[PDB]
Amino acid sequence: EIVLTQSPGTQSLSPGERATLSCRASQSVGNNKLAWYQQRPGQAPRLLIYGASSRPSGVADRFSGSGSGTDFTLTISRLEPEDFAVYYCQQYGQSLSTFGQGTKVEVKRTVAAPSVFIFPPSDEQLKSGTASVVCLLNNFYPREAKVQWKVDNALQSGNSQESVTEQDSKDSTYSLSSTLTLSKADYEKHKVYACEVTHQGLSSPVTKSFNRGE
Amino acid sequence: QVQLVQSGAEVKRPGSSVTVSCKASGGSFSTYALSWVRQAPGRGLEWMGGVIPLLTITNYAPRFQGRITITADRSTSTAYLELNSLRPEDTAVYYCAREGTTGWGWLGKPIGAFAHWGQGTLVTVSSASTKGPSVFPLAPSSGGTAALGCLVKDYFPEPVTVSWNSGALTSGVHTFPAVLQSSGLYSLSSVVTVPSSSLGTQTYICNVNHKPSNTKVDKKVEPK
């Protein structure tokens, strides 16, 4: 099996800039049968490059493929607003076809610290037997941020799930939502419920907290 | 041009078998390789297998070789993907792809790479039944920028649509992607940041819709 390793994982660039994406094969790709695909959220992939360098009719000339053997490269001469998406590389020199893990090309902007909010479980949900505390990280960049749950100042680990929105079309930031889920019984055994966030735009880690019933 | 039309989305219980269809319309169906490429939510693309209809030459990926079966019907120009012994980790969007041709017709050699994709087929493998969501209020705290929202908890299956004030409120709204809880039910959050001064004057109701269970909830969110 041929293993394709794309680089980098994420590409932070601005509209008007040049974008170069790398694809490294574990072993030599036969007959240079390397292809490049573009995919946007909720859409099927779109063929950009095939045969490592050939470009299908209908693809902008800013997309150019290059390289051979084990090293391949997709080049975007000048990034356009709709060129910010996910890019997969695929080998089909062997019968057994393999993909890369993909490279996301995002819009790079000035680092922005998130506005942190915390939400106690509603009285309605407490009657059902469960407790959900929601930590909100609003409009931040870059995507790399860490959320740590602290119940009575004790690191909670394995009862929380987080999700991130796609990069905004306006301010090019991200928003994260982490939801800590306890049973009503466990929830009433403690008092201080706090969410700790560490981010580049924050000098010191910010902690938002509330006291149960207060 | 050529276009590939796949069958609708479906939900299957673990252990069962699913069959996805793919109807082609355009070029020659017999001499171009038809492949299947799946993609788990948030994850990357994964090649499953392909078939050249003329010689019925199939080629499966070793990871699926044993429970997967790809056939091509030259009578209806329809390829079929059959996946047996389904398990929750097979939950993905299944795409039918066909190799491109060199430019146009007649004098058009095959290029191997996938130039033509279907719209995709969502296959959800879960042991859960259709359940309407419970909508709980994420009430704003007791500058400058205050956050509120509604928690859409414990529903199945996808999707759930959320609007604010019947669509009259869009600025500053964030509806996060749903997460798969251990219960096998989905859960998302829909938040919105507004001026703090408007908390005591502006009514904030969220409209949550869940078509599969035919559920519509208008939950009002106000300060505690």
Side-chain angles (χ1 to χ4, degrees), chain A residues 1-95 97-126 128-145 147-169 171-213, chain B residues 2-22 24-42 44-105 108 110-140 143-210 212-215 217-219 221-223:
Chain A
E1 185 191 21
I2 302 184
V3 176
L4 304 181
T5 304
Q6 306 197 203
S7 177
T10 312
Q11 189 78 273
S12 303
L13 295 178
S14 200
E17 283 193 304
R18 163 190 183 94
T20 129
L21 299 78
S22 106
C23 191
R24 179 180 298 182
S26 171
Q27 61 201 81
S28 234
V29 176
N31 284 336
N32 283 348
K33 288 178 168 66
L34 202 283
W36 287 92
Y37 299 83
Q38 179 198 70
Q39 185 182 40
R40 295 191 193 86
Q43 267 183 9
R46 189 172 61 97
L47 182 59
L48 290 174
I49 297 294
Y50 73 99
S53 30
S54 303
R55 170 181 70 255
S57 61
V59 179
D61 58 327
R62 51 180 187 266
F63 300 100
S64 71
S66 61
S68 66
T70 52
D71 295 333
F72 296 96
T73 297
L74 175 66
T75 303
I76 314 176
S77 63
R78 190 208 188 277
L79 282 171
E80 301 278 314
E82 69 278 12
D83 291 341
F84 292 90
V86 185
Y87 294 84
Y88 295 98
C89 74
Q90 176 222 9
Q91 69 86 17
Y92 53 100
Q94 279 188 16
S95 56
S97 188
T98 59
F99 286 92
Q101 77 282 25
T103 294
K104 173 175 185 158
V105 184
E106 65 152 344
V107 176
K108 180 179 188 177
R109 51 76 47 81
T110 54
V111 48
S115 303
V116 190
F117 306 87
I118 190 168
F119 294 96
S122 57
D123 284 345
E124 293 101 306
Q125 193 200 106
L126 292 170
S128 72
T130 328
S132 292
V133 190
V134 178
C135 209
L136 165 63
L137 282 65
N138 193 250
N139 295 36
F140 61 95
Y141 181 88
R143 184 197 246 272
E144 23 265 28
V147 167
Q148 258 184 103
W149 282 105
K150 293 182 172 203
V151 175
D152 280 336
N153 210 333
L155 279 72
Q156 296 284 303
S157 65
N159 38 6
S160 63
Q161 292 185 318
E162 72 178 30
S163 75
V164 184
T165 62
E166 290 290 342
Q167 182 171 62
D168 202 81
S169 58
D171 55 19
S172 288
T173 56
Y174 297 87
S175 290
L176 184 145
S177 172
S178 181
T179 311
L180 175 64
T181 305
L182 293 165
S183 65
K184 176 186 166 183
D186 290 330
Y187 178 63
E188 286 171 354
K189 294 193 216 166
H190 305 90
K191 183 189 180 193
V192 178
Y193 287 82
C195 66
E196 181 189 51
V197 285
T198 64
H199 187 259
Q200 206 176 332
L202 294 173
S203 47
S204 295
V206 172
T207 298
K208 288 293 180 172
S209 57
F210 73 97
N211 295 313
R212 183 187 60 92
Chain B
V2 76
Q3 63 241 356
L4 315 171
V5 176
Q6 307 183 212
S7 48
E10 44 188 301
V11 179
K12 306 290 289 185
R13 301 296 179 97
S16 64
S17 296
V18 66
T19 298
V20 187
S21 69
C22 180
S25 253
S28 175
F29 168 79
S30 301
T31 171
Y32 295 95
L34 202 289
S35 308
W36 289 93
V37 176
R38 79 172 187 178
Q39 181 187 41
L45 296 175
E46 185 182 21
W47 183 77
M48 305 186 66
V51 55
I52 309 183
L54 185 54
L55 298 166
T56 323
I57 301 295
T58 63
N59 222 86
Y60 305 120
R63 294 166 177 166
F64 304 107
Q65 181 69 266
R67 57 200 189 96
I68 191 168
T69 298
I70 304 164
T71 65
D73 198 350
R74 299 182 59 198
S75 70
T76 67
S77 295
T78 303
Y80 296 91
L81 170 65
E82 179 185 3
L83 198 61
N84 307 322
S85 292
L86 285 171
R87 19 201 178 90
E89 27 279 296
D90 284 327
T91 296
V93 176
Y94 292 80
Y95 293 100
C96 77
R98 198 214 81 179
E99 62 172 330
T101 176
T102 13
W104 56 106
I111 75 177
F114 310 142
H116 313 285
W117 296 74
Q119 83 286 349
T121 296
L122 176 62
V123 176
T124 308
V125 181
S126 113
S127 64
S129 47
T130 311
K131 179 184 181 304
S134 286
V135 185
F136 304 113
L138 297 186
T145 293
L148 62 101
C150 310
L151 177 63
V152 194
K153 183 155 183 53
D154 296 328
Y155 66 88
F156 184 88
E158 290 280 57
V160 154
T161 61
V162 178
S163 67
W164 281 96
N165 292 12
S166 302
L169 171 59
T170 67
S171 293
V173 175
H174 286 312
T175 298
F176 300 83
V179 296
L180 183 62
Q181 306 176 115
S182 58
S183 64
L185 307 179
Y186 297 98
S187 173
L188 69 83
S189 55
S190 184
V191 308
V192 51
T193 48
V194 297
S196 335
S197 57
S198 65
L199 279 182
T201 63
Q202 177 74 53
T203 306
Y204 295 105
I205 63 163
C206 62
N207 322 98
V208 182
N209 196 95
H210 182 252
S213 74
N214 208 49
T215 305
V217 174
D218 294 329
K219 200 76 181 189
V221 182
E222 47 191 349

